[PDB]
Amino acid sequence: GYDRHITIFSPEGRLYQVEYAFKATNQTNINSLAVRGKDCTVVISQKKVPDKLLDPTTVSYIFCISRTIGMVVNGPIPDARNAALRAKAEAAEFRYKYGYDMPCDVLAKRMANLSQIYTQRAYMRPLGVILTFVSVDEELGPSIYKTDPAGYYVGYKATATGPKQQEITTNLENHFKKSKIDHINEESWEKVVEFAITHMIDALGTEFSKNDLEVGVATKDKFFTLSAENIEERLVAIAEQ
Amino acid sequence: NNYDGDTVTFSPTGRLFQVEYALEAIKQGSVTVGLRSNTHAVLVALKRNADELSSYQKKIIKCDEHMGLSLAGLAPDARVLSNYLRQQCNYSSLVFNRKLAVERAGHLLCDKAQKNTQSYGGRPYGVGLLIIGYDKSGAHLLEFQPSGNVTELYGTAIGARSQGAKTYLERTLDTFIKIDGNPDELIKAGVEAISQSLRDESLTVDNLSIAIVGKDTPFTIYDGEAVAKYI
Amino acid sequence: MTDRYSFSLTTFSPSGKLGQIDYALTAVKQGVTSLGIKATNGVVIATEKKSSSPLAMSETLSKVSLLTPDIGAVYSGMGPDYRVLVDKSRKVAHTSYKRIYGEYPPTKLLVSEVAKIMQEATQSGGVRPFGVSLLIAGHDEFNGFSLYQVDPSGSYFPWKATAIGKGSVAAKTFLEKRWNDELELEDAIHIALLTLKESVEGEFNGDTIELAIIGDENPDLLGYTGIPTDKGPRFRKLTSQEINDRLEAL
Amino acid sequence: MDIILGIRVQDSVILASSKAVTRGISVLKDSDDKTRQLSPHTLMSFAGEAGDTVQFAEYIQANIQLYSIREDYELSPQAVSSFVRQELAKSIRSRRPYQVNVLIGGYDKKKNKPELYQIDYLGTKVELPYGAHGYSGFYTFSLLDHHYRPDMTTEEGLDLLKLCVQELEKRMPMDFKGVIVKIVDKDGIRQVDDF
Amino acid sequence: GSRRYDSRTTIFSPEGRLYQVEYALESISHAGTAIGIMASDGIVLAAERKVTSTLLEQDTSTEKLYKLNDKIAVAVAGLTADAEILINTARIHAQNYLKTYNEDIPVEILVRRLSDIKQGYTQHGGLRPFGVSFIYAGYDDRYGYQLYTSNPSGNYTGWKAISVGANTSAAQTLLQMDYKDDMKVDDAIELALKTLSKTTDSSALTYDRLEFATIRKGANDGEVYQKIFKPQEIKDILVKTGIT
Amino acid sequence: DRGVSTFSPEGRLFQVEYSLEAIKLGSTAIGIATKEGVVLGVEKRATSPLLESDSIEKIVEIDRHIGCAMSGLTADARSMIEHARTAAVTHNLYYDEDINVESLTQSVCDLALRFGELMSRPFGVALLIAGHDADDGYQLFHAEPSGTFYRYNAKAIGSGSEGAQAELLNEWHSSLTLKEAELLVLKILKQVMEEKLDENNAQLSCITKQDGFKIYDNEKTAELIKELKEKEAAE
Amino acid sequence: QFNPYGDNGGTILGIAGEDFAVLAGDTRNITDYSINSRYEPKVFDCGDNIVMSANGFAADGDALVKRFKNSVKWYHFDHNDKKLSINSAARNIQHLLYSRRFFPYYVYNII
Amino acid sequence: GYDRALSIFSPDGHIFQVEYALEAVKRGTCAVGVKGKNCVVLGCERRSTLKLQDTRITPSKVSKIDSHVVLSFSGLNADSRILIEKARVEAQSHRLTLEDPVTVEYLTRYVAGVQQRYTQSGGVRPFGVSTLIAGFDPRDDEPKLYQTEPSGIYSSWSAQTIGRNSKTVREFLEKNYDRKEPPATVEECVKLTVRSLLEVVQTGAKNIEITVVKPDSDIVALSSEEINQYVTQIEQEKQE
Amino acid sequence: TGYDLSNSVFSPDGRNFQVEYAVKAVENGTTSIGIKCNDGVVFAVEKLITSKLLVPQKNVKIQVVDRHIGCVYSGLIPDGRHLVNRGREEAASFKKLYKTPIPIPAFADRLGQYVQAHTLYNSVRPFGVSTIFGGVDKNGAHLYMLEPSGSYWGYKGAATGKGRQSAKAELEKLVDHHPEGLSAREAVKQAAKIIYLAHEDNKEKDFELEISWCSLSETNGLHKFVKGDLLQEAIDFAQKEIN
Ligand SMILES: [Cl-]
C-alpha cells in the first residue's frame, strides 16, 4: 500500500496524498470569508490567539502579496508562508518581465500549476493549504480566485473556507439568491466589511470582539489590512443598527 | 525497530537509532583516556592487536604542531575526520597566519558529523575522538561523539570499560588539574587512569600509546620503548 | 533535496498490465462527460460545466481551450492535469513547429506532440501518468477537418464521432445511430446537444454547457485587416446565447 | 607536407606522394609514406600541417576498420569519402581545426570502377579523374588536361605521372625528394618500388 | 527516502530472467497479431487492428504499420505510444546514416540500433522497458529482402516468415506448414491473410480490422516501392483471395 | 530494502561484514615475514583439469619492492592492484624514490569505504601486501574491505585461515630463514588444501631487498615440495 | 592592461661544500628605482634540513615557498614522519612549478 | 541519475544478482572451445525451436573482435552485443595508441573488466553473459583460448564449454582431451569439437556451428555440408 | 499504517508524524527561555552538568547571529548549530545586498522557510530543535520561537524543553503583573529565577545557568553575554526566590 504514501494513482484512480492534504487545511480550525463590493473586494478571517504569551500582532493568515493582490490562507502557517513567499516572488518577477502588475487570476493559475506539479511528481509533497487571492483587477474589477492542493482553481462571486465553510457558503448563497446580483451593492468598503462580518456572525452563530477577527480590503491600486481599532469601529456600527 | 533502517528517520520517542548504533561502535572500541592541567594536555590510549603475529592498531593521530586526537571505533572514519582537521588547521595557518583554536576545531567537527545525520544515503561516523591541544587560551581537552556533540572537559575516557577511568578522573579532578610544569607526572596520572579500565591484560611496551602537548611542547606521540618509562 | 525518484513509477505487472495507466483511465471514467462529432464542413466538441459551487463563476473556468487558431481541445478526468497539458500543447505548437516552418502545425502532428508528452509521463522517472483523456478537434489545409482522442498511455485514435468520461458507453451508442458522412456542422451541433442532455442531471442551458466548433474562417475575430491570405481562426467558442438559441430548436 | 597527386585510369587509381619531411631548415626524412590504407580496396593520401595529418589519417583509419569488423563488409569509396568530408566539415568550425587535405583512391568492387576523391581541410569534396592539393595542381594540371584519357592503362597512367613529377622537379623551388607511388585496383593496394 | 518506492525494473529473477521483459512480453501477447512473410520478389506485412468501432476514422488511422524510410517499414505489436517514441528515433538514425555515408542505411544496422536502445532499458536507468515488439520489413543491395523481429529484451533475429502479438504459437505453425522458399509475393499475400483469418479472435476478418503493406521490386526497373494499402485496397485483396 | 551504508544494532556496517563472508569462501593465501625476506604463497584451486593452471594469477607484482596476494572475489582485486601500481609509480614520479609499504597499503585501503548511493558495494577480496623499504624493513600487511589494515609477522586468509593461523601461531619465530619460511608456507598450504599439493595447484613467491619481488617457477617450487616431503619423513 | 608580473630584484647564491651547503641572498626588495625594504628576508628554512630561496617576482616567490613548506608538512603526515631527502624535495618542487606551466611562478629558485 | 545499488552482498556473503546472471548463462545455448596444436575451434549450439529463420542475416554466434581474435558466448543475446561492441572499440583503440593489435589475453582482460565494473556500479545490473575468447597473438603460433563470466573472473583453458548442458560436454572433454597430445591437425580438432556437441545437441543438422581460427588472421566458418560430413563419419564409427 | 516511517508523508489525519517525532526530541532536551523587555530581549538556558569533569562556563550554548541577534535552542544540539550556521549565511547575504543589518522579523522567516523546507522531502530529516531567538532592530525589540514544523510566532515570553510548562506558567505571571512592561535588568533577574524554577523537571543532576541579552539602553542594541557580577547578582536573586 505505497500508493497512499506518494502521489501515484490508487486502483480507484485516486490520489490519497492530495486528499489528506485537504484535511491538513482545517488543522488551524479557522474560518475565512471573501466577498465583492462595487469598488472593492473584502476578505475576513477568524483570529484565534489561544496563548497569552503570544504577540497577537504577529499572528496572521492574511498576506500582502503585491500592492494590488492580497492572499488569505487556510492551513498550517509553515505551508502558508511557503506559498506566500513564492507568490510574492512570482508577482515581482511577472512585473519585471512583462511590464505590468500581475493579475489576481493569473497568479492564482500560476500557484495552481505549481500545486499540480506536486500532485504528479513524487519527490514533492502537496502543500496542505487553500489559497484565496483577492484584488480589484484593472481589467476584471473586484476578483476572488481560490487555489487548493489538487491544483484546482476558479473565480468566485464570494467564497468561504474552513471547518464551517458549508454554513457560511449557504448563508452567502441565500443572500445572493435574494439580491440577484454578483456582488454587494455598496459604495464604501467600510459597509462591505460590515456586511462580511454580519453574515459570518449569522452563519457561525458567534459574536466577535475586535481581537477575534482579521480583515483584508482590496481597492483600486492597493490592498491593505485593518487594525484592531479599525475593526472596532466596524463592530460598533454593526451593533448600532 | 522499524525506524533504524536509515539516519533520516526519527523513532516515535524522538530517537535516531542509526546514530545510536554508531555510538555502539565506540563502546566496542579499545579504551582511550584524555586529561589536562593548565600547562599540558595528555592522551593515553590502549592499542588493540588482532593476534600475537599482528601489530597493535594505532590510536593517536597528529593534526598540527599544537593539536591532535585519539580514536575509538572505526579507524577509517577517524582518518577521514583527522584529515579534515589537518586541512582546517592548515587553512587557518595559510590564510590567517593563525593557529586554529581547539574550541573552534570542535565546532567544525560537530558540524561535519551533523550533516551525515540529517541526509539520506549517507551514514553517521562510527568513531569517537578525544582532541587535545594548546592554543592562545592554554591547554584544552575535547570529547567528540558522532552524534555531533562536542564537549570541553578537564578529563575523560571513551571505549570499552571507559567508566572505570572516568570515575578515577572524577575523584582525581582537584589533583591532576594542578600538575603544572610537570609533563611526566601528568602522564603518570593518565596511565593510572587508563589502568582502571583494564581486565586480564596489562600495559606492555607495544600495547601502550601516549601523546602530549603543552606550553613549550609540540604535539608528540610516544610508542615502543619510549613508554617503557611509564609501565 | 534533488529529485531522487529517477526510476519508473509505472511498471508491468505479472499479467502484463501497466497499473498506473489503467488507474488513470479509471480516473477518466469518473470525470464529467465530454464528446466530439465531425461533420463535412466542421467539427464540434462539447462538455458540461460542472460547477463546484453556485458562488463560483463558471465562466472563468474554461474546459474547452484554443490550442491554435484552427485547433481546439476538451477533456474528461482531472482538470488541473488538463490545464497544464494545454499550456504545454500551446507552447510545443510554437517551439517544435511554427518557429521552424512559419505556420501552425496540422492537427495530427500537434496531437502527436501532446501524445508524446503523455507517454513520457508513463515511462519517465518519478512521475505518474496524466489523469485525463483529450478530444482534439482541428482543421488544416491538406488533411481537412479531423477529430482525435488521446489517452493517458499516449495512444491516440482518429474518430468520426466519440465520447469520453462518465456516460461514454451510452453516448457512443447514441452517436452510432445518429452519425453519417453527410452531416452539416449545424446538424452535428444539434446531435451534440441531444447526446449531452442524456448525461446531464441538473440545469441544461448555455451557462452550464461549454461548446466550441472548428468551422469556417472568422475574419471578424482576426483583429486586423490588410493581408488577404490571413482570413482568421477556424476555432470558435459558442456563446451562452448561441447555445440557448439552438436549445429551443431541440 | 608538400605534394600529393592522384590519377584515375581505366581499371585503377594511382596516388603519388612526396617523401620529404622538413623541420626548420633541415630535411629530417626522405622516405616518408604520406598514406594510410583505410580498407583493402581504399587508400588515403594526405598533406597539411605537421602532426594533424597523421593524427587525422590514423583516426579515419581506425573508424573505417571498426566499421569493417562490425558489419563484416567493406564500405564503398564513395561512403568512406563522405564520412571523411563530414569529419573535416565538422572540424573546420571547431576550436582548433584539423589542417589536413586528402586524396581518397579506392576501387569499388560492386561497380567494378576505380574512384578518386579530392577533399580539402574545409570539407570541400570533389570526384575527379585526376587531382592534387596545394601548388601541385598549378604545375601538373596542364599536362593532365592534355594527355589524360579515361581508357588509359595503368602503365600509361604511370608514364603520365612520371611526366608530372619531372615538371614538378623542374619548376618547383622546393626539393620534395621524389614520390612514393601506389596503385589501387580490383586486387587491392600495391606499391611501385621503382620510380 | 525514495528507495522505498523503487520497483527495480532492471533485475534478474532467481531463474535468470528479466521480470519486466517477461511481463512486457505478456502485455504484447494481448496485442493485435502482426505477420511478416518474405518472398523472392518482395515482402508482405499484414496486421490486425484491435476491436475497432464503426465511428473510427480508418483512412487517416495508423496503429500497426509505419514507414521508417523509403526502403524499410515496421509492423507494431504492443503499446502504440511506446512504439512511436522508438519509430521517430529509428527514422533519425536512418537519416544520420544517409547524411554521413551518402547511402541508404542497411536494414540490419537500423534494426541493431533500435534493439540496442531497448536493451539499455533492461540493464540500466531504472526505467520500465518499451512494451513493443517490431517486425522489420526492408531492402538493401547487400542481402536484398529481409525480415527481422525485435522484442523488449533487445534481442533480434532474422526470418523467412514470422508473427508477433496474439496467437503467435498458432500463427507460426500455420506459416511453417504452407511456406516454401520459391514462394512469390502474391502467394505470400494470400498466406498472410489466410493465417490471420484462422488465428483471429474476431468472428470474421474484414477490411476495417486490417492494416496491410508490401515491399516490392515491382517498381519500374531496379528499385524498390513501399505500398501502404488503403482501406478500399485491403477490401479488394480480401475478395481476390476469397476471404469475404 | 535498506541502505548500503547502514549500521547494525551492534555498531557494524552490514555490507562490510557480509563481504568478509565472501572472503572466507576464497582460496587460501599465506604470508610469512622474516629478516631475510617475506614469502607469499597461494592455493590456485582450478575448477577443472582442462583449465590451464599457470593462467591463475593470484600473486601479483605492485612494484619491484612490493608484492601482493589475494583471496575471495579475485575479480574485485584488479582495480585495487591497478590503483596500487599507479600510486607506487606516481609517488616515484613526484619524489624520486620508492614508496613505503605502509603508505602504499594505506592508499589501497582508502578505496575500501568509498561505497554508497563512488562504487555500489565494498570489495569482496582481502589482500596480503608484502614488501621492503629502508625505514621499516621487511613488512607484511593484511588489507581488508573495512578500510582497516593490520601489520603481521605471519598471516593466512581464505577458507583455511583459522586452521592455518593457529599453525602459524606455533611455527613463527623472529629468527626464521627464507628457506624455512618457504617450506612453512608449503607445509601449511598442503594441510588446509582439499586436493593434494603440487607445483601446478600451488604457487610461491617472495620479496627480498636484493632481487625484489619474484614469483617462483614451477620447477623451483617442485624441488621445495620434494625437500618438504623428505624432511617430514625424516622424523 | 593589467600586468600580473613584477620584478622585485634581488640576487641569490648557493654553494655546495664537501659536507655542508650555503644559500645566500641579499635583503633588498625593490620596484623600479625605489627601495621597498632594506631588510626583507629571501632565504628560508623549510624544515628537514632544507633551505630555499625563490628569486624574481616576490609574490610568486612567497607563494612557492609557502606551498613547499606545506608540502613538507603533508609529507610527514602521509609517510610516517619520514625525512624528506633533498633529491625528493627537488622533484616535488619541479611538479609545483609545472602546475603553472602556462601561467608560471616567475622565479628562479634554489634549494 | 539512477544510482541504486542493485548488486549487493547478502548475509551469507553472496552477490545474488551476479549469481542470477550465471543462471541466465545456464539457460543460453551451448558454446564450446577446443584448441589444437596449431589452431583453435569454436563450436556453438543453435536451438531448433526456431525454424523459418533466415540464417544469412540472423546474428551469428561467433563474432570477430579483430582480424586475429574471435568471441563466442552463452546467455542473454542483447547483453553480448554491448560487450562485443566495447571489445571491438578497444581493439582499434589499442592499435591506435600502441601500434600493435591486442593480445588475446589483453582483450579478455578488458572484457572481463567491463563485466566486473557492472557488478559494483550503481544503477546497473551484471551482464547475463559468459564468453569464450580465442585467437593467436600477433607473430605467434601458440593457440589461445580464454573464458569470462558475469563476476568478471577470467582464465585460460585447453578446452572449455559454457551454456546449457555444459556440464555434460565438459564431462566428455575431460575424458577425451589429452594435454600431452592435443588435436594435431584441424580435422582432429573439429572432429573432437563436433563429437562434444553431439553429446547434447539433438540433431546434427543446422544445430551445430563451427568456426576454425588459425594463426596469422586465418579465420573461416564451416558450412552445413562440411559439418554434416563430420556428423556422418562420427556415427558410422559409433555403430561398432 | 506506515505513514510515520517517511518524512513529508501526510497521514490520513493530515499530519506529518516525522515532524511530531522531532518534537519529542525537543521535549527531551534541556530547558531554554526568552523574555521580551522594554527595549530588548533576554535569553537564558539550562545546562545540565553531566559530570564534574565538564569545564565551567566553557560549553557555551547560546549563539550570536550577526551582531544584534541571539539564538538559543532545546533538543538535538548539532541540529541547532546547523540552523544557526544557515542563519548567519542568511544574515550576511541580506546585509551584503541591502547594507542594513537583517531585521528580526525578516530573519525569523529566513529560518522558518529553511526549517519548513526540511518537511517537504523524504530525503531529509526534520530539525530536532525548537529555537528561541530575537534582538533589536530599527522597529524595536522582537522575540521569536521556531518549531520543527517551521512554525514560528512573535512572543512576549517563550519557553521550550523538558521544563517548558513550569516556565510558561512563570512567564504568564510576569505578563499579567507587568502590562506597562519589564526592564532589561529586571528581565535578566526574572530569567534566572525561571530557569531555576524550571530545573525541578531536571532535578537529578545539578546545572549551570547561562544568560544573554540585547537591549537598546544596556548593550547599545548588540547581543552580549551576561557575565561576572551581573550574572552572580541574577543567580543570587534566583536562589533567594526558590528558598
Ligand atoms: Cl505555470
Short mmCIF file of N, CA and C in Angstrom, two decimals, chain F residues 200-233:
data_model
loop_
_atom_site.label_atom_id
_atom_site.label_comp_id
_atom_site.label_asym_id
_atom_site.label_seq_id
_atom_site.Cartn_x
_atom_site.Cartn_y
_atom_site.Cartn_z
N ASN F 200 51.67 -27.39 -9.58
CA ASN F 200 50.68 -26.88 -10.53
C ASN F 200 49.43 -26.26 -9.89
N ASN F 201 49.09 -26.70 -8.68
CA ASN F 201 47.91 -26.18 -7.96
C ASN F 201 48.26 -25.28 -6.76
N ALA F 202 49.55 -25.01 -6.58
CA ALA F 202 50.02 -24.07 -5.57
C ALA F 202 51.17 -23.25 -6.13
N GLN F 203 51.31 -22.02 -5.64
CA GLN F 203 52.33 -21.10 -6.15
C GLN F 203 53.04 -20.38 -5.01
N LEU F 204 54.36 -20.22 -5.15
CA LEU F 204 55.16 -19.49 -4.18
C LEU F 204 55.74 -18.21 -4.78
N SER F 205 56.08 -17.28 -3.90
CA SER F 205 56.70 -16.02 -4.28
C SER F 205 57.39 -15.41 -3.07
N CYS F 206 58.31 -14.49 -3.32
CA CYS F 206 58.99 -13.79 -2.24
C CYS F 206 59.42 -12.39 -2.65
N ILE F 207 59.77 -11.59 -1.65
CA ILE F 207 60.31 -10.25 -1.86
C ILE F 207 61.56 -10.11 -0.98
N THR F 208 62.69 -9.86 -1.63
CA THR F 208 63.96 -9.60 -0.95
C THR F 208 64.48 -8.23 -1.37
N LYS F 209 65.33 -7.64 -0.53
CA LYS F 209 65.92 -6.34 -0.83
C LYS F 209 66.78 -6.37 -2.10
N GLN F 210 67.55 -7.45 -2.27
CA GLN F 210 68.46 -7.57 -3.41
C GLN F 210 67.73 -7.75 -4.73
N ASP F 211 66.96 -8.83 -4.83
CA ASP F 211 66.35 -9.24 -6.10
C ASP F 211 64.93 -8.70 -6.31
N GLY F 212 64.34 -8.13 -5.26
CA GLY F 212 62.98 -7.60 -5.35
C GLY F 212 61.94 -8.70 -5.36
N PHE F 213 60.76 -8.38 -5.89
CA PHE F 213 59.64 -9.32 -5.90
C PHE F 213 59.77 -10.34 -7.03
N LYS F 214 59.69 -11.62 -6.68
CA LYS F 214 59.81 -12.72 -7.65
C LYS F 214 58.73 -13.77 -7.42
N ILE F 215 58.04 -14.15 -8.50
CA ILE F 215 57.17 -15.33 -8.49
C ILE F 215 58.03 -16.54 -8.86
N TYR F 216 57.87 -17.62 -8.11
CA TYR F 216 58.70 -18.81 -8.29
C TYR F 216 58.26 -19.64 -9.49
N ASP F 217 59.23 -20.23 -10.18
CA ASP F 217 58.94 -21.18 -11.26
C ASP F 217 58.31 -22.44 -10.69
N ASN F 218 57.59 -23.17 -11.54
CA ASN F 218 57.01 -24.45 -11.13
C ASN F 218 58.08 -25.51 -10.88
N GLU F 219 59.21 -25.39 -11.57
CA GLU F 219 60.35 -26.29 -11.36
C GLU F 219 61.03 -26.00 -10.02
N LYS F 220 61.14 -24.72 -9.68
CA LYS F 220 61.74 -24.30 -8.41
C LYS F 220 60.89 -24.72 -7.22
N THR F 221 59.58 -24.52 -7.33
CA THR F 221 58.64 -24.90 -6.27
C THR F 221 58.59 -26.42 -6.09
N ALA F 222 58.60 -27.15 -7.21
CA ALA F 222 58.58 -28.62 -7.19
C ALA F 222 59.71 -29.20 -6.35
N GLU F 223 60.90 -28.60 -6.44
CA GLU F 223 62.04 -29.01 -5.63
C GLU F 223 61.82 -28.74 -4.14
N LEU F 224 61.21 -27.60 -3.82
CA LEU F 224 60.90 -27.24 -2.43
C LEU F 224 59.81 -28.14 -1.83
N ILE F 225 58.93 -28.66 -2.69
CA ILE F 225 57.92 -29.64 -2.27
C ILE F 225 58.58 -30.98 -1.97
N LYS F 226 59.50 -31.40 -2.84
CA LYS F 226 60.26 -32.64 -2.65
C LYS F 226 61.16 -32.56 -1.41
N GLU F 227 61.72 -31.38 -1.17
CA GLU F 227 62.52 -31.14 0.03
C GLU F 227 61.66 -31.19 1.30
N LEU F 228 60.41 -30.76 1.18
CA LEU F 228 59.47 -30.78 2.30
C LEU F 228 59.09 -32.22 2.67
N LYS F 229 58.73 -33.01 1.66
CA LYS F 229 58.31 -34.40 1.86
C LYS F 229 59.38 -35.21 2.58
N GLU F 230 60.64 -35.01 2.18
CA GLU F 230 61.77 -35.74 2.75
C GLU F 230 62.04 -35.36 4.21
N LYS F 231 61.92 -34.07 4.52
CA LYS F 231 62.17 -33.59 5.89
C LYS F 231 61.04 -33.93 6.86
N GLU F 232 59.83 -34.17 6.34
CA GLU F 232 58.72 -34.65 7.16
C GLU F 232 58.83 -36.16 7.40
N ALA F 233 59.37 -36.88 6.42
CA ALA F 233 59.64 -38.31 6.56
C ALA F 233 60.89 -38.58 7.41
#
